[PDB]
Scaffold this active site. Structure first.
Site: not given
Ligand SMILES: OC[C@H]1O[C@@H](O[C@@H]2[C@@H](O)[C@H](O[C@@H]3[C@@H](O)[C@H](O)O[C@H](CO)[C@H]3O)O[C@H](CO)[C@H]2O)[C@H](O)[C@@H](O)[C@@H]1O
Ligand SMILES: OC[C@H]1O[C@@H](O[C@@H]2[C@@H](O)[C@H](O)O[C@H](CO)[C@H]2O)[C@H](O)[C@@H](O)[C@@H]1O
Ligand code: CA
Length: 394
Positions: A186, A296
């Site tokens: 990512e 959490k």
């Molecule tokens: O923290 C726990 C978990 O995090 C995961 O990563 C996510 C990102 O994939 C995520 O990306 C978002 C999208 O899911 C969504 O569809 O769109 C928004 C944009 O508007 C994105 O921000 O972003 C979050 C932070 O916001 C990350 O935590 C991991 O893949 C997972 O492995 C991890 O444990």
């Protein structure tokens, strides 16, 4: 060692192991809380090892590495019908920046895991989950709220670490186990220079092949729209054994959480339709059962949940407290969860398959394949359907 055309990945991430994630192992971070005040809790592994100092970090991490995942895990994974694991690891397992607080020792356990995978007929991706300076500012890169992977020499350091992984794990010793090396978990494309990210990916692809390796290169989609990578690393350019890793959740914004359960299933179905249109082999390398961001610290230490209107100005939907323990879940939440998991399974099986995030957590059930399975919400066997054909794929 894998047929990407014919076969389907049915996998789990071994997350929370070599890169600490507060929501996955909160017990490692909770000792720094002063009652209800979380302002003193290290927000990521960089800060956690820095606070502890090297001796204590190594003592505590050795105990974690040696018990969090063991051979018994690999046996259970196999017993449950899974054929694959994705193994995140941080760049610091291989190389420290000057003044990095991280401790090393993960490679010993990575190598024990590759043997356990061989023993249990499980295939593996090795995933470089965190680059120096951070490629995404997530705590799971090692370094929250920094976005400096393309700053200074950090991209070159990330390439050098990749070269080490390519030499150790991309050659003949593991050609029966390792079916992919993922260049970078990512990278947050929206804040990066994509031209420079593409060049980095092309550099990694070329270095691996130049070692004589035939291992597939796994390119994470860097949060781009479906199809964005269709004309990158292509057969027409003699660039081959390339797989795109897409990650999918519906919990990290207010809009996606607001969806009713039918709309969450429609979105899951549409991931399948869209992935089918893509030109490369592709796998959903991270996804979960989560319909909320309640776990959490899922959004980070000292941050609340959007689901209860407690993060990111999201409007309140519901209270998180009753969703923390799967024994407090409503029958409605259990049913929504089974429906959602089956729809994502069907969508992801429509192309290369799927790798659930994650095998286990201490106490976050939406993110634990073990807990969800033991509670009858993740299909077991994984082909079982209580809600068959939600997507209508053809
Ligand atoms: O923290 C726990 C978990 O995090 C995961 O990563 C996510 C990102 O994939 C995520 O990306 C978002 C999208 O899911 C969504 O569809 O769109 C928004 C944009 O508007 C994105 O921000 O972003 C979050 C932070 O916001 C990350 O935590 C991991 O893949 C997972 O492995 C991890 O444990
Ligand atoms: O379909 C995209 C994938 O195509 C691969 O090329 C070949 C396949 O199309 C073919 O059916 O099988 C051979 C034998 O393994 C493949 O080389 C590319 O190699 C992949 O990079 C690409 O994602
Ligand atoms: Ca919802």
């Amino acid at each position: 060692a894998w047929d990407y055309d014919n076969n389907v990945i049915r996998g789990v991430n071994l997350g929370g192991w070599f890169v600490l994630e507060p929501y996955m192992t909160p017990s490692l971070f909770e000792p720094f809380q002063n009652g209800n005040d979380q302002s003193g809790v290290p927000v990521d592994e960089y800060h956690w090892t820095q606070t502890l100092g090297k001796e204590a970090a190594l003592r505590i991490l050795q105990k974690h590495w040696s018990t969090w995942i063991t051979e018994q895990d690999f046996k259970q994974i196999s017993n449950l019908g899974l054929n694959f694991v994705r193994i995140p690891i941080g760049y610091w397992a291989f190389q420290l920046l000057d003044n990095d607080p991280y401790v090393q020792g993960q490679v010993q356990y990575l190598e024990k895991a590759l043997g356990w995978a061989r023993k249990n007929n499980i295939r593996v991706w090795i995933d470089l989950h965190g680059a120096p300076g951070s490629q995404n500012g997530f705590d799971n890169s090692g370094l929250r709220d920094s976005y400096n992977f393309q700053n200074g020499d950090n991209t070159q350091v990330t390439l050098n670490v990749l070269n080490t992984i390519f030499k150790k794990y991309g050659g003949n010793e593991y050609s029966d186990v390792v079916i992919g090396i993922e260049l970078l978990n990512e990278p947050l494309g929206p804040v990066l220079n994509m031209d420079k990210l593409k060049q980095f990916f092309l550099d990694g692809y070329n270095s691996l092949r130049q070692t004589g390796s035939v291992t597939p290169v796994i390119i994470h989609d860097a949060a781009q729209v479906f199809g964005y990578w269709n004309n990158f690393l292509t057969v027409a350019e003699g660039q081959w054994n390339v797989v795109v890793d897409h990650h999918h959740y519906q919990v990290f914004s207010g809009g996606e959480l607001s969806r009713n359960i039918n709309d969450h299933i429609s979105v899951a179905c549409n991931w399948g339709w869209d992935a089918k249109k893509e030109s490369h082999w592709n796998v959903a390398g991270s996804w979960s059962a989560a319909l909320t961001d309640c776990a959490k610290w899922l959004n980070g230490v000292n941050r609340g949940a959007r689901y209860e209107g407690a993060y990111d100005n999201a409007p309140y939907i519901g209270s998180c407290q009753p969703l923390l323990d799967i024994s407090q879940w409503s029958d409605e939440h259990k049913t929504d969860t089974r429906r959602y998991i089956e729809a994502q399974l069907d969508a992801f099986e429509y192309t290369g398959g799927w790798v659930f995030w994650s095998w286990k957590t201490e106490n976050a059930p939406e993110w634990s394949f073990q807990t969800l399975t033991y509670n009858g919400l993740f299909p077991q066997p994984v082909t079982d359907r209580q809600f068959p054909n939600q997507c209508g794929f053809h």
